Each structure stands twice: as structure tokens, then as C-alpha cells.
Design a protein around this ligand. Sequence first.
Ligand SMILES: CCCCCCCCCCCC[N+](C)(C)[O-]
Ligand SMILES: [Mg+2]
Ligand SMILES: [Mg+2]
Length: 395
Amino acid sequence: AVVYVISKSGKPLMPTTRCGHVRILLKEGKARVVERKPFTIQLTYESAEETQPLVLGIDPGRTNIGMSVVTESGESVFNAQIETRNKDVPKLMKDRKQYRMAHRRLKRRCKRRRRAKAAGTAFEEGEKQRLLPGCFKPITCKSIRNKEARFNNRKRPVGWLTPTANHLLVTHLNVVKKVQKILPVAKVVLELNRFSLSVLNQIIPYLADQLADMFPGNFCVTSGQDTYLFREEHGIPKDHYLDAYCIACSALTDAKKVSSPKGRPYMVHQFRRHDRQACHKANLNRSYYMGGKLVATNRHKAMDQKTDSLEEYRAAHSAADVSKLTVKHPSAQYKDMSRIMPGSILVSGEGKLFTLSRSEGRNKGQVNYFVSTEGIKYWARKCQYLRNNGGLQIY
RNA sequence: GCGGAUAACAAUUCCCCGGCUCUUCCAACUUAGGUUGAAAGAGCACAGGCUGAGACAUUCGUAAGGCCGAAAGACCGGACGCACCCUGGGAUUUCCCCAGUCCCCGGAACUGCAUAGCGGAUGCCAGUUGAUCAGAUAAGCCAGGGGGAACAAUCACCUCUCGAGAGAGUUUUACAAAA
DNA sequence: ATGGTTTTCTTCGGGGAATTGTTATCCGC
DNA sequence: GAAGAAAACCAT
Ligand SMILES: CCCCCCCCCCCC[N+](C)(C)[O-]
Ligand SMILES: [Mg+2]
Ligand SMILES: [Mg+2]
């Protein structure tokens, strides 16, 4: 019911409600459909670029961010819910730290120790206890000294944030810019909540500081208590996606046309821009089979292994059973590092356009199925690639 | 302004379980060979990018000053030593950019270290061939983290008809006025 | 029946130690 | 999420 308009110069204009005029404009070539959702058209002719003030209200969250644009009278012209991938970041970073430590131990430290043992350049006692500065307890260095441990004097800029905190802050800032692309936002209101979630608390001062440099003299702050009062006074239904509506309407001095937005908000999903991991599966389990049935997982138990190993099998079975055993160790699997990534736009073999949620299956170097953001699976060989992932996607 | 408490998530180094390839030897099971296992030993460690030496061991040295001792030295201290600190320049590094780690030259203030780190000497571990460059050369560094740009087979809402086709549905992108 | 193709279903490396750091909130002097 | 094996299928 609301169409977004962009001028010929590319400057956002006010939304229209005259859908018949939009259809006529597109029919005669005076406009082009820039985006499917939200439906946006760019004018081809030249006209006045005159816009009334619009207020943007941000309900901030780690997982769900609400955004609502209202007019000076309180009419709502845009509501969006953004689902972020912030929770993924700490686990990916922890996995990366573990992989880096494994790289630096298996490929560097152990090889150096092997070379020292082979060359006779090792400790006479074989191991040494080193007490390093800043430590009260020693470390054990086997056959050679440790590589220098650097933890005494490491500095960061004032205001340093973790990759997770930076991700949340940059996501909050990026959704505002994407909204500014379609709408002429004049004022921004941010909800500030009293202390009672750690990353959000870390970024709120930074978000407020950088939201005031983007809107000089047009940045406002509201409280979660004011949202409750607004909901009680104006009767807005209790729903999270409506909270941003109560935030933007907090900036309006004389509210006359105030009503809860009717319809469903736009839903935005976040997809990672890079996947730098080459390996898919490091199959490190040496499985033993007795007549097609698995009986042991390794020669001895690995760390935190509940399943029996070959040691238990040998202890509980004869020599003729161990002598008749088959070994399966699947090779490591690797991803296609130049694959079609989630968030991409494709058209199926029947003309259906969809956003890629994931790729399932593979045969003869080809993806089997493309699963979209609605759950439907499409034959990937009869699908055509249209657009790459752009980070934030309407679905 | 400082101190304390709480939470989140960032970094360096070390140690282990397990995994892969090969050798020796023993055992079991099978058609001299083959399969599985035990023991001992050796090598190996995302796909990759950069780099030509930098890893290791022993030994010597590592300011002034204070304090203990007669005997070198112990402790404090910290610089004229070193740096994770700081200026500049780089690798990873790319469609654009960053984070993190690391390297090189230098050392005003700040910060940190002296059982460390750095340097010297001695030993040990590479590669070497094609026309000054190129090649080769590891016990060298980084590598599984984040955003953005660009890329469409982009026509939505409403009405009518049988998912498909057609359509001024009030005028301006919009307010205002007008209809 | 045999060979090729599509659909369902399964599965993915861990532990410890010597240390350090940043951001936010709150409290107190 | 993504790769790959087993099952299931459909067939000529
Ligand atoms: C948070 C929801 C944001 C949805 C808005 C999507 C922004 C797309 C902007 C397209 C405009 C491109 N162009 C060339 C006209 O500038
Ligand atoms: Mg809120
Ligand atoms: Mg490699």
C-alpha cells in the first residue's frame, strides 16, 4: 500500500500511496522498479525534490533490531525487524583461536622439537622450567625454549571493542544507512534502557555517539519507560515490532494522526560476507568394523570419548576377532570456497525468484539443492544465479 | 579522578589425548603373498599467501646509583640494554576496507621487561642452476574473524476475468490547494 | 535386470596450564 | 551449511 520513490538524481523522496499512478508511471517508462521488497521505483523524468521531515526510531537489540519511520503527524511509512547474526561471532572466533593454536603447535612447536632431538640441540635434562616475567609459576619447555610469550605490555586504542561488539555496532549503523537509501530520514530517536545483553550495553554509548554525528542536531533519546507510557496512552497492541513505532513517535511534539501500523513489518536477515574456511570435515576417526558393524572408534580413546576404542575391544575379545577387522577412515572434506553463498538471489527452473538460505548435497562437483529462506528446495542445476549476498537481505 | 565488584569477549606462550604416512620386529587370520593388531622408532599437521634464511644449544656481555659482604657475588633499581611501547614502512591482503597476528628501520614523551629479551662467539640444521637478474632454499611469518560495494530474468498493492492475462485506481515523489 | 538419476539422511576434534587485555554497568571516597 | 553415502527410483 506504500511505494517508495527515488528521484532521478538518486535522492530519496517521500513515499506514495497512489498505486494506480505508480502502475501508469512504470507502464510509460517514467519509472523503473529498483527493488522488489520494499517496492521501490526510481523516477526517470526530472521533477522537484521536496520532502517533509521523517523521524526514524530505533529499538536496539542484539538479536532483533526494530526500526520505524513516521511522519510529523505520526503516520507510519516503514517498519522493519532485523534479525542479526551476532551470536554466531563468538563461537566462530573461539573456533578460529583453537585452529590457530593447533597450527602453531603441530606445524611449528612439535616440528622444532623433533629437529632439536634429531640434531642434538636439545636440553641435556630434556625439559626446563622457565619462570617468565609477570608469572609466579613456571612453564615446562620440552627439549627447547619456548617461543617468546608476549603478554606483559599490549595496548589498544581508547574505545577498543571486541569483534562481536563491533559487529553489533556496525550492524546497527548499517541498517540506518540502508533505510536512508529509500527514505529521506531527518531525525533519529534511540531508545535507552536503564541497567537491570553485555555487548549491547557495551555498544549503546558508541551507537549514540555515532548516531549524533550522522544527524547533527537531529538525534534524540527516549527511554523504555516512555515506550510503556506511550503504549498505555495510545493503545498500541503489545508487540515487539511496534516498539520502534513508539520510539519515533516520541519525537513528535503535536501528535494528531497516531495509530498502530497495520500490516506485517519487513523482515531482514543477516548473512556473513566471508567464509575463509577451506576445510569442511577433518575426519579424524579411525573406525573399526566387524562384519559391517562398527566396534571401535580409535586405537585408544581420544579426549572425552564415550564410545569404546580398540583397546577395549582387544581387552574384551580374542586375537581372532582383532585379526578379522576392517578399518574405515574417510578422507578430509573441503568446501567450495568460490561457491554461491547464502543471501544470494537466484531464479529457479520454473521462474521462481528466491534468496539462498543454504546449499544441500553435492554430486559430481555440483550442488544438489538450493534451499531458500522459505524452506523450499530447488534443483540447483536448473537454477540461475542473479545476485550475490549483500549482507542484509529482505526475506 | 581513583579504587572495588560484576559481566561479556579479545591476545601470546607452553603441555597432553587422539589422528595420518613409513620402517623394524612379533602375533593372529587368510588366498610365499595379503589383511588386522601389539611394541619400538621416524616423519607429518586447514586449501593456501608471503619470504630467504632463521630456528635451536652452550658460553660471554647487558648502564648509573643504593644496599649486604669481603670473596666472587646476592637483592633493589632502572638505562647508555631490550620491547608486546611509539613514529614511519611492510606480510597476511583481497572488488573496497578492517580486525587479529607478525616482520623491518629508528628510539622525544608514555608504557612494559632484566630467571626476560637482545647482541657477540662457538656448534648444528638448507638450497645451487638458467640467461646482474631469475630459479632453488625453513627449525621463518601469516592463514578457519568482520563489514561494505557491484552484479536481476526486479512490475509490488487494488479491481476484473479464467497461478495466468488485462486495467487511470484523483491530482503532486510529497505537503498544500484543487477535483 | 542393470545402469543412471534424484531424494533422504547423516555428521562434523578435544582437554589443560603460565599470563595479559578491552568495553559496559553499578557502588564507594 | 555443506558434503557425501545410501536409498530409492525410474527406467530402457
Ligand atoms: C532495512 C531495510 C532496508 C531496505 C531498503 C533497501 C535499500 C536498497 C536501495 C536501492 C536503491 C539503489 N539505487 C541505485 C536506486 O540507488
Ligand atoms: Mg528495546
Ligand atoms: Mg599449506
